[PDB]
Design a binder for this molecule. Structure first.
Ligand SMILES: CN1[C@H]2C[C@H](OC(=O)[C@H](CO)c3ccccc3)C[C@@H]1[C@@H](O)C2
Ligand SMILES: [Sr+2]
Ligand SMILES: [Sr+2]
Ligand SMILES: [V+3]
Length: 326
């Protein structure tokens, strides 16, 4: 690998990361109250859990993964149509909702992630948005339209379980706090030296909540002990974001996680990031505050948070450090 992709010594993955046997696998077809309670325990203690029997068609999951892998198999001449000015876009504001290929890294010891990313908005689905999506493969738009609607449906169910668990009214997040739905498809090609590379560096998701679909190993969670998140192809991995951490006044944990590279086989993952518009104000939910539970963050601009989050990776919570109070 070129030196571009060489991570700093302290950020490199150990070669023998154990399976996380205490990662909660939550069956959404249990009784309502049991689902609320198990989800609540997972959010308070871990911030990362898998959902099964989640009501999203397994057939559609397999079809979306097929069309995403078909996309990354396309020749250079097709992929160039998604590279503004002949190169991949950067994860910086303004973050546009039209489909683009992205490159990602850290600017500390500057290095690149061993990863290609397709990203686009998904909400609301209109003709203009879908017309900005990939033209090839032919089925991408119709498959990923159905997927994004279904994934949102599931995400809003999970948020309402979360509302019940916290004692917030149902629909608390069904507003400006869940307005942006970015779908990222990540392609990790084989890496000849996995010891010095990362598919994705350690991070909280900056948004509210993320659903991640995987069928191969590579996802790891920090619990300074890293563990491997068992890939269940028919499950979704639920990652609680830094925004939900702030809004719950740290009653919920955020998921700190990373992706390691593989020397022999490639990997494709699908991540749906739901969260606020860049115009939102984020603060601890007033309904939960008291003299016993005083706010640990002052109100802040999501845009202003966005800029720090995407640029400064000196600390996992660099984005929210300026707004910490008490
Ligand atoms: C490792 N990178 C982090 C930053 C960026 O994330 C995004 O692109 C999301 C998309 O919602 C975002 C969240 C919060 C603020 C801005 C962007 C791309 C990827 C993600 O896995 C998380
Ligand atoms: Sr190019
Ligand atoms: Sr177009
Ligand atoms: V993530």
């Amino acid at each position: 690998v070129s030196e571009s992709f060489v991570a700093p010594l302290e950020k490199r993955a150990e070669n023998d990361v154990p399976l996380g046997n205490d990662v909660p696998i939550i069956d959404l077809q249990q009784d309502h109250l049991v689902v609320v309670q198990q989800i609540t325990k997972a959010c308070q203690d871990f911030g990362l859990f898998q959902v099964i029997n989640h009501g999203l068609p397994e057939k559609l999951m397999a079809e979306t993964m097929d069309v995403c892998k078909e996309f990354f198999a396309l020749p250079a001449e097709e992929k160039e149509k998604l590279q503004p000015k002949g190169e991949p876009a950067k994860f910086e504001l303004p973050l546009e909702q039209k489909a683009k290929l992205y490159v990602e890294g850290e600017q500390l010891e500057a290095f690149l992630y061993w990863k290609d990313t397709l990203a686009h908005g998904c909400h609301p689905l209109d003709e203009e948005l879908v017309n900005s999506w990939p033209e090839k493969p032919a089925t991408y738009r119709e498959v990923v339209a159905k997927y994004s609607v279904e994934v949102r449906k599931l995400t809003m169910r999970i948020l309402d379980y979360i509302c019940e668990g916290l004692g917030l009214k149902l629909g608390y997040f069904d507003n400006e706090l869940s307005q942006i739905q970015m779908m990222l498809t990540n392609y990790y090609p084989p890496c000849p030296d996995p010891s010095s590379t990362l598919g994705s560096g350690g991070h909280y998701d900056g948004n509210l909540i993320t659903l991640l679909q995987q069928n191969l190993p590579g996802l790891q969670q920090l619990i300074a002990k890293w563990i491997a998140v068992e890939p269940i192809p028919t499950a979704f991995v639920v990652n609680l974001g830094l925004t939900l951490k702030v809004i719950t006044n740290e009653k919920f944990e955020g998921s700190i996680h990373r992706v390691v590279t593989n020397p022999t086989r490639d990997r494709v993952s699908i991540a749906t990031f739901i969260g606020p518009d860049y115009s939102c104000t984020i603060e601890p939910a007033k309904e939960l505050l008291s003299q016993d539970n005083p706010p640990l963050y002052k109100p802040y601009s999501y845009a202003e948070f966005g800029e720090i989050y995407l640029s400064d990776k000196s600390d996992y919570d660099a984005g929210v450090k300026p707004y910490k109070i008490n």
